[PDB]
Amino acid sequence: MQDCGLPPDVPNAQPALEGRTSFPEDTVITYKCEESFVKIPGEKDSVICLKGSQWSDIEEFCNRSCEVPTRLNSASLKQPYITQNYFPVGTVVEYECRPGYRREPSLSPKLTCLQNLKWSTAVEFCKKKSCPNPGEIRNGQIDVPGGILFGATISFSCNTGYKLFGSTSSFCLISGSSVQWSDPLPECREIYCPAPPQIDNGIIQGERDHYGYRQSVTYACNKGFTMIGEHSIYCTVNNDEGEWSGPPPECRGC
Amino acid sequence: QDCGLPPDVPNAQPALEGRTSFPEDTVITYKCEESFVKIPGEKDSVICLKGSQWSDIEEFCNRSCEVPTRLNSASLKQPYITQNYFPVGTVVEYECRPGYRREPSLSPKLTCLQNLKWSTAVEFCKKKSCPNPGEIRNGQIDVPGGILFGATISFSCNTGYKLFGSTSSFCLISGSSVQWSDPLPECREIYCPAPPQIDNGIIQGERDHYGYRQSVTYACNKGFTMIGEHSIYCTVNNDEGEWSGPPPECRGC
């Protein structure tokens, strides 16, 4: 009769019958691989109802493959693997470095599917690129807690008596074809105390324009006056603010 | 042949020894009464002569000031320093003691007043001053009460420095002048012990010396995690250098 019966049973595949058990000549039925199975490229996945109520031949076309290789932050799959989904046991793919990573020549950039149905153990074939030497800050310091490779952070500080002007930290980020420091080296500026106080019936010996950390100002009473107090005071510096060690002396008469 | 009572001399009293009759050749001496002093080169005694007659005697006492009161700034000059006769109008001169100096604008002279009193005293001899104390590098000098003869000054070293030498000085008289009893002390920077090294970590740009408030920053080697404070600083536990706390630790992952 001009009709075929059920189509052939294909291992690990299920045919789409669409709610019927009888099919007319020239009917084309397509099979879909079952869960945990992927179709083999370059193979037939359907049958056809020919004359004599006979279905065309079909061979197993499903496997049995790894999952798509897991996403790496250091390397991307090369072509043509990057567009593939069929990875039977034994399949080996190749990677290439992303930015800002570079090859580690001693290590292979290739992975394999386990019977296991699992990709081989991952190694660091693509390593983090390094940022330039951070250099130095005059009168300050650079804190490098964890190297200077891509993704690293460094902080800046100014020695006692200096104030920091600029950025307080920098990060090694990817910059086009390489990796560079997010922010330039800041500046450590000398902190000045307020102008020293004058005193009644006394003077400051050779008063300077600016007074920095620990610098001192010496006092002297005018003729006929007695000094009561510290002969000199010095510049103290805390929390980036200058402040004199204490009050200036007094010149009492007479 | 015995004389009777000796002559009455104004402002003087004779020493009679309770006697009312005196034999020939008896010599009686008079003592000036309160406030009076005998006049140098004058007779103060009489002698009983023949004819029961006393020898003549004239007033020999002049009202006089007392020996000038002692001053600590100056001393009487010669010859006043050895004198006791100071009638009204007498002026004496002083000279400075040590360690005092002359106040050029003033007179170093005193006059006995009509009321038998020395004129008002002024500061003609003033205390000398020791030289300017100077400066102590990284330290301070406290002058609580001037730098004249007898004054005291103290020394101190700023935070982070230790005082080596004298802690005070006193303006003493030294021969022909006044000088400070002690020389300036030195204020020397205190250093903390060398900062400790840590397993599997380093000191970022270590220095050969670390003073007060100076810090040392640590960093762990690739593959280790730091546990504790990243940097420590040099404190001063008087008068010693000491690190703020323990260095961090690097734990292997």
UniProtKB/Swiss-Prot annotation, chain A:
Disulfide bonds: 4-49, 33-62, 66-113, 97-126, 131-172, 158-188, 193-235, 221-251
Domain Sushi as annotated: residue spans: 3-64, 64-128, 129-190, 191-253
Keywords: Blood group antigen, Cell membrane, Complement pathway, Disease variant, Disulfide bond, Glycoprotein, GPI-anchor, Host cell receptor for virus entry, Host-virus interaction, Immunity, Innate immunity, Lipoprotein, Membrane, Receptor, Repeat, Secreted, Signal, Sushi
Tissue expression: Expressed on the plasma membranes of all cell types that are in intimate contact with plasma complement proteins. It is also found on the surfaces of epithelial cells lining extracellular compartments, and variants of the molecule are present in body fluids and in extracellular matrix.
SUBUNIT field: Monomer (major form) and non-disulfide-linked, covalent homodimer (minor form). Interacts with ADGRE5.
Disease implication from the record: Complement hyperactivation, angiopathic thrombosis, and protein-losing enteropathy: An autosomal recessive disease characterized by abdominal pain and diarrhea, primary intestinal lymphangiectasia, edema due to hypoproteinemia, malabsorption, and less frequently, bowel inflammation, recurrent infections, and angiopathic thromboembolic disease. Patients' T lymphocytes show increased complement activation causing surface deposition of complement and the generation of soluble C5a.
Name the record gives this protein: Complement decay-accelerating factor
Species in which this protein is naturally found: Homo sapiens
Gene: CD55
Section covered of the full-length record: 35 to 285 of 381
